[PDB]
Paper text:
Pf4 exists as a prophage in PAO1 and encodes a homologue of the P2 phage repressor C and was recently named Pf4r. X-ray crystal structure analysis shows that Pf4r forms symmetric homo-dimers homologous to the E.coli bacteriophage P2 RepC protein. Li et al. demonstrated that repressor C, which they named Pf4r, was responsible for immunity to Pf4 infection and also regulated replication of the Pf4 phage by repressing the expression of xisF4. Central to these effects of the Pf4 phage in P. aeruginosa is the repressor protein, Pf4r, which not only controls immunity to infection and phage replication but also acts to regulate the expression of host genes.
The mutated Pf4r, with non-synonymous mutations, will be referred to here as Pf4r*. However, we were successful in generating high-quality crystals for the Pf4r* mutant from which the structure was directly determined and from which the Pf4r structure was modelled. The Pf4r* structure was solved initially by single anomalous dispersion (SAD) and then by molecular replacement (MR) to a final resolution of 1.97 Å in the space group C 2 2 21, yielding an asymmetric unit containing two protein chains (A and B). An Arg to Leu substitution at position 80 (blue spheres) maps to an exposed surface of the protein on the opposite side of the dimer complex from the predicted DNA-binding motif and also well away from the dimerisation interface. We do not predict this mutation to affect DNA binding or dimerisation, but it is possible it may affect some protein–protein interaction with a currently unknown partner. The second mutation, a Ser to Pro mutation at residue 4 (78879A>G), was observed to reside directly at the dimer interface (pink spheres). The mutation in Pf4r* to proline at position 4 may mean that only weaker hydrophobic interactions can be made, and the homodimerisation may be less stable. In contrast, Pf4r* eluted as a monomer with a molecular mass equivalent of a dimer as determined by MALS. This would suggest that the mutations in Pf4r* significantly reduce dimerisation and hence, prevent DNA binding.
Numbering used by the authors:
A (entry chain A), B (entry chain A): 2 to 80
Write the structure that this text describes.
């Protein structure tokens, strides 16, 4: 996967409330969600405020549980 | 700092050779370098291929040497 696919996977699961509380535009956010527009550093910034544990996975697709860097599938599998 | 500032710090230090060998457009790369255009996931993808140890720092501004995630200033200070 690309960083954009991993970012969009998280973007598709966040609505106006969490986007607004972490300081993003929702209108842009929805256009990124749909694929209409490229994921920028702006979206990465909001996601890493929302999901600080996913910052490594977003950028690289890898995880490091040793330093509290996980992924959505990892957290789901770890419940 | 933002992810865009940290990305541009690395983008400003990479020329056509390393950009091309990791599969990016240089013309876009230079427009991102100058600030003319937003840093996208495309630039993050090339940077994390070039600098896999900086993927966490690019996304979050933090480091984790425990898992080989560093920064430019950290590596320079560690010589």
């Amino acid at each position: 996967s690309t960083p954009a696919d991993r970012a969009r996977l998280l973007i598709k699961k966040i609505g106006p409330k969490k986007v607004s509380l972490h300081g993003g535009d929702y209108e842009r956010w929805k256009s990124v969600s749909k694929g209409a527009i490229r994921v920028s550093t702006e979206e990465i910034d909001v996601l890493v405020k929302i999901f600080p544990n996913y910052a490594l996975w977003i950028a690289s697709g890898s995880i490091a549980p040793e330093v509290g860097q996980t992924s959505p599938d990892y957290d789901e599998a770890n419940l």
